[PDB]
Design a protein around this ligand. Sequence first.
Ligand code: HDD
Ligand code: HDD
Ligand code: HDD
Lengths: 726, 726, 308, 83
Amino acid sequence: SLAPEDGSHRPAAEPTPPGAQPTAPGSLKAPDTRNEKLNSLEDVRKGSENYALTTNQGVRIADDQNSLRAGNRGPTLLEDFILREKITHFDHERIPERIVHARGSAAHGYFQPYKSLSDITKADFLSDPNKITPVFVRFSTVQGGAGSADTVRDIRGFATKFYTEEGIFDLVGNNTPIFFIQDAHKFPDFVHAVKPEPHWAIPQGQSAHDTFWDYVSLQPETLHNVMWAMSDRGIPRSYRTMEGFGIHTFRLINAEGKATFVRFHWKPLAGKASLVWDEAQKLTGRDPDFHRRELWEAIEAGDFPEYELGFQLIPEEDEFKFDFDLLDPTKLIPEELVPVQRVGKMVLNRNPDNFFAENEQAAFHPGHIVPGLDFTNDPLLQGRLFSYTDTQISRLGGPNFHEIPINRPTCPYHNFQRDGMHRMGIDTNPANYEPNSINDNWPRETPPGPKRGGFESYQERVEGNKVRERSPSFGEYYSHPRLFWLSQTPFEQRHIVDGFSFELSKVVRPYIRERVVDQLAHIDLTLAQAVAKNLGIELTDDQLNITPPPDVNGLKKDPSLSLYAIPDGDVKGRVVAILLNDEVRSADLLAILKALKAKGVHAKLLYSRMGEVTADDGTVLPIAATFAGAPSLTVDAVIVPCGNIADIADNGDANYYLMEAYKHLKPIALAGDARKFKATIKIADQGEEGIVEADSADGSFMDELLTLMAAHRVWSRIPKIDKIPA
Amino acid sequence: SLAPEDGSHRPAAEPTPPGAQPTAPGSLKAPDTRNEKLNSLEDVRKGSENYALTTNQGVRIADDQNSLRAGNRGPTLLEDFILREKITHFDHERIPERIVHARGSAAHGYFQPYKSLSDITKADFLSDPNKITPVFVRFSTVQGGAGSADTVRDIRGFATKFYTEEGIFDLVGNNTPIFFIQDAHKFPDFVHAVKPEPHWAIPQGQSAHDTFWDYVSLQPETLHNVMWAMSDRGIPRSYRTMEGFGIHTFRLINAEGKATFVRFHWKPLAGKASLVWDEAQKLTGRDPDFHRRELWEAIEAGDFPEYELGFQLIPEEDEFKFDFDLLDPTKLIPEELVPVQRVGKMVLNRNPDNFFAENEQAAFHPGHIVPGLDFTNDPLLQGRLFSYTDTQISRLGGPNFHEIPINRPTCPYHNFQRDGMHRMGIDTNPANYEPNSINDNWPRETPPGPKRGGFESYQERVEGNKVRERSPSFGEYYSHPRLFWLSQTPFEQRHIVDGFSFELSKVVRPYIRERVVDQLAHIDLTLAQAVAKNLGIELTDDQLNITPPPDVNGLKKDPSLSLYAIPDGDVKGRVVAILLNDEVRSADLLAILKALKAKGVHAKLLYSRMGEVTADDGTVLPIAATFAGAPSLTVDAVIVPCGNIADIADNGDANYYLMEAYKHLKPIALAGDARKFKATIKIADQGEEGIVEADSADGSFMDELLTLMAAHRVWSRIPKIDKIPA
Amino acid sequence: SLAPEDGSHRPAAEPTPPGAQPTAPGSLKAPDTRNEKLNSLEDVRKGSENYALTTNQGVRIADDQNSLRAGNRGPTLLEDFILREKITHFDHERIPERIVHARGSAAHGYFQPYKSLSDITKADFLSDPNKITPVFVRFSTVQGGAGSADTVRDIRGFATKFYTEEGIFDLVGNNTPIFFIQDAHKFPDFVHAVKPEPHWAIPQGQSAHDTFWDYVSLQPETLHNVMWAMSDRGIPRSYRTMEGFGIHTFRLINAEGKATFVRFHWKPLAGKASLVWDEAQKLTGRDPDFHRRELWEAIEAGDFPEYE
Amino acid sequence: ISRLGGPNFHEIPINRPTCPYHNFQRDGMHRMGIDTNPANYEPNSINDNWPRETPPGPKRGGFESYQERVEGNKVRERSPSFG
Ligand code: HDD
Ligand code: HDD
Ligand code: HDD
């Protein structure tokens, strides 16, 4: 027995806060958390405890430490079938990664509608508020490989597999409401431009290079989603604190055949929250797995990610009532014109057991719809429908990818398809064709109907010639980028300017920078001027005379486009660094932990070494990490209790902890003699907004700190941080 | 609903004779035939009756007759996901065929030992006479593709997968006791030589071409298995009427660690029986699926193929007591020297449900042994051990081929292997490595022991230098071919001569023919002279002075090497053609069917058209096939009952039916006026051996016929038919 | 060394009648028969005479008769990279066969127009009678596997790859002027019905079984091509003596933008000729390679297959 | 075989030898080399046994393993000297 006698190798199978215990496969951490999909996977789940180690053929292995050789210092023998089986499997472990969205993190959960939607769709999973649908959700970046970092600047994917009683419905969306391009024919062009450049395969996980901004400067249709990527939307704090969008206009079809246009939305119950660029970039180095880890640990703690599904609904007769084309995926539908109507709630409440088998092998595809839904002529969606089926033939090894366990429907499936690589289902049907008499034509077609009916496309009218031709209605590129820009707060606008500025400074060919700035001048001249000055570029008289695009149906601002104009952050599930010393004032720590617990805010106790320190009252404090091992990047706020402050007052890592937190706009609280640290962050004796201070951590101290946390970051501090060397 | 009103489209779930009803998947035909392996496949079996037709994602299909198009005479739309899924799966149905043995037919069954063998092997499946082991068996040819013909002249494969309680054991044998080559390094050379030639990919299923006999003439080690292939061994009547052999010397290991050398044997309880060449070749045209069909119908009839497993056992100390090397796979062990000791019986009693899923994807490999068995230094076996693992990576699409349902062990299997294409098992082990503490080192190694122990190789001595060198003890090539030749009956010797002569006549380069005849002169000069005469080659004086090779340990013959020298026929499961007329004597037919039923012999009612005829007593007789639809090639004997013989007496197909049956040495029985057909085959008034005749089909009539059938063929007829125009 | 002294191992590099000499790879039988496509393949052609036997990495092999073992009667060693490379390549020789038309025989040649067709099409390979276009043609059956027999009753495929100056044009036709079904959505149903039945994978190369005629009886659109299949059209004497059809109506587009509907035809210069059924069936047994052999030997004899 | 899609990975340009290579190996996925050898096996007479084995020698010779001594029993055992 190699496990420690005290059983400390095994995490408790109950919810525990981040860092308290080692993480674990979901079936071991939360065995009582069940749903119909999780239950259906039991046939393929493999145990381990009390089993003998065997080959894949079931032969018990006596010595898993040695190859078979002629003498114990001799050559290895070809007849060692145990060695060759073990190494052969190792040698073939890897499969192709996803062409895009290769980096991602996934969890199990369930969805429930608030009310029956039978009046607008016959989709069974939306038919009854008591009907629970299991889901599997994968969040992702777009550009980088499966081994790339989480907190990059990028669009994020938000893919949901609904295992409904009438088939699998995949809602395959992103965290912004539009995409970069209009027609799917250009997807390889755009993706090649953003991906690592082909001669040297640089840069990973970044749009900050020549070919991306070359394409952008020549394809102004990209400018709307570029604006979103350059905002703090491109660097979310957590998959739990971003929105999701289906982007395309789809259709809802009801039992009477009536079609309603719909765009899909996910709204996070934890609110919207993002990092700042310097923090996000440094965090890809200090913890490239930050979002994967934060998602997994939130679920292990009971901080289940929750999202509200919502519909923007447009009747068929309103198709042409907007300044933009509903079928153009570079255009958003402003919520001020078409509100998001709440539909239901999705809870993610259990992690996978095996990342590769469940996450890496999962296959989502927006062509997977169910009766009650349909497509539109959106020309980006139209080409998507080809790609997601085609790409699985190489990525997952052939056409039986629906038999990979995570991908299997939980409802029945029967047809006349046969064979293919790794075929699992053994069909007993005498017939493999229809029409047939020898099996009385089973399985049989089903007419469409109000429930449990066959799928039939909505019979929309098609008229025109066969043409490769962009719709003229799509030929407008600046008004929605302007609407987004003018919907942001002044500090969000600064971060957008600084996003463009940072990225264009990495473009080696200066004329590309100049051409992008010219595009910006067609959107908004305050933005263009601010970027140009960071690039040493002077706008011309003609550029300063470019007429701005008009409002979007009278809108200059839509409040739903800003992350922060109306703060909506829940503090539950956030985390606070507590900087210890070797004789902490226990009365301070008591008040701190009392208040954090009451708000569901987690804490990590940090010090200059691991092990334990003893407080002034004799309490033994276990150390979660060192100052350098868990940097301020990984937390939302910092608190310094009183005690033997001299122990850490001269510690360079402790002082830098506060300076980095200060620079990144995080709330900081200093008790007692810890107020001496104000000098390090250049805070005057009188204090300033965003720095909590008092003689001791009391009731009022922690209310002030948690109020700051509710507002996410201290935006008023921005004018001071450029003088801070951090 | 498209089935006939009378519900007659479905075969009965009961044993029925060949051709009576449509064949069916094994689960429908015999649902009460069960074993542990068949039962374990129920997780992946799919039904069909009373289910809706769906996509692979579970969406019900309304119209499986049409593509989605813009207008009913317009272009097909990319958004038709139902069409594209269906065509995508069709487009990727095929997987690589096996490099060799691509043509094969398989069935389920079970094995049982007669008595515990624990005195000589600790293998669990041989430890207890009440231990039932499920098997899956695949028979095959070698050279031809998966769509080539069954009754070619070739070696046959005989592979048995044992699903034992201590792991999968694959016994991967052929139907002759030796192979063509000594060292696995030459296998691609030999296989390329026998396969279709690389410029034009001709000929399929035939060794009768230049490159095969080129290789043979230059590699005399091949001559022994060539002898077997040129005998009637190369054209079996049925997979049920041939022997099986493991070929290699293996080892049995008992609980005290003693090693016994062993060669494995399968003896057919239906006896040994082969076709003749003209019949076998024409049958590849009239029914290329004859062996596959015959096996399937025998099982549906309850004529379960049975085979006795036997062991040739040689003590370790007798390794060098023979004239030949025990580890040389071109040498057989004469049963006159080492008898085959009976071990157990295998019964094949159920067909698969889906050929592709169960047959095409099954993976056998002789490196799949279990504790109680081990290898030897046989250099052909040694290289086999590398091949069977390697080849599955492309054939079955990755390293998880053991998770394909037919390949799965029924015993537990757990290890630290992970991922790979189409990974099915979802591991919950916190550890994917050992030694580990975090899962207390589970799954754990098992020390070797008398039962349920871990695998450990027999610690045989290895001594010598690293050399690419053939053992000198392998360098004798003619003694065993000569022993085989001398052990055959005179008519079997004639058929060997005719095999060589026919094949070498299809060799275009005459010098190759001459070099092969020269090799034959080193085996036996009678054989060489007879083949040379058929090729217009005259032996030289030097060739006529070649000394014959020595006897094999004093043996002048070994009758176990002949198909027919020692009678072992068994008529159960054979088939007789009954040639009908439009008013058959019901008394003849009554006595015929009665007598066949008492011996388990089946009958096929044939006529000049399909439909029905009525006997003289009003019995309506359904017709199974026409004379040309089911030629005499497909049956073991022919009976012509009395009645309105004028109806068929001038029918050309009926007359040729008897001429073909006569040429191929099959018993024929003629009742009453059917004796007019004696004129067609030139039988004398007084009769001849092999022709049954009487005033009526009485009981003595049928006893003579069934006695002939038990002798398989009428060998005394050969000189008569050597001049038959048929 | 191993060749006979009289040189009779090697066929003459000039036309010879069927059976007179061993058949050979085309570059060795007819080294002076060229076209632009055949020449463009010289970069990947590999010789053999006077070269050393090597691994795929270029290492010369001294002993290609034996595995490396510990003693000449010992176990084979894992370090034998020459053995493992040779067996690995053999172990992975096969690729998936075509879903349909898996059985097929092919040759090189060229195409030339009789006159300019600029009035009705701007296709460059039809622009004038001096446009020489290399082709590669594959004839096939439909139902059987790659190792099935040639002279089955079946439809035949007739596929031509034109290597034109403005891109590849594949004319993928059959030897009858229609197909069995109207809408591609039904293709897996029809093909599954004619193919070997899924429980036992019987019969090979034959429509003569229940599921095919079940489908036919329930889908009368199939009856026209069934009539052709049941006629002697279904058992051609040679790929040289059958017609070819593109089946579909396509379009020709000229330089002025005018569209003309077109159906494509191949007419055999050797005339139309078919077997009779008893002969065709027995011949699948006596020589399952008859059509492949006959095509190859015709070309080696100089009886070049020609089609208008 | 999985990473590069089959046994012809030596035909991918960067992997190709710059020296000659000839043997009797055939087919495999994405096979680039078109072999004109009448034979795909050795020993053969129909191509006078080309390409031919080469004896080991001081230069341009065939590969032959060093004939080091092997002595022991077939064991799965670590050498004590490694401990
Ligand atoms: C025609 C090509 C094409 C186009 C225009 C798009 N995509 Fe895509 N997308 C793919 C082709 C593709 C793909 C290549 O099929 C991927 C990569 C591998 C895969 O399974 O699907 C994929 C992956 C993928 C994933 C990851 C799913 C997962 O976690 O496995 C998400 C979330 C999206 N896409 C979302 C979008 C959105 C919101 C788009 C614009 C509205 C979009 N894609 C346009
Ligand atoms: C080193 C190469 C090699 C050598 C020397 C042999 N084989 Fe083999 N054999 C294979 C390499 C191989 C293979 C390439 O691994 C096959 C083809 C596909 C497969 O899965 O295994 C195979 C298939 C195969 C099958 C078909 C199994 C099935 O039904 O799927 C049988 C019955 C045999 N072999 C029997 C033998 C016998 C009796 C041999 C001589 C004693 C022999 N093989 C030598
Ligand atoms: C939608 C599916 C589908 C349909 C409706 C058809 N085919 Fe097809 N055909 C294929 C799908 C296919 C294929 C599966 O794509 C094949 C098999 C392997 C391949 O490369 O193409 C093929 C092979 C194939 C070949 C063999 C080409 C070769 O030698 O490699 C020929 C000659 C044809 N087809 C001809 C036809 C004709 C004349 C059709 C009716 C007008 C037809 N096919 C309908």
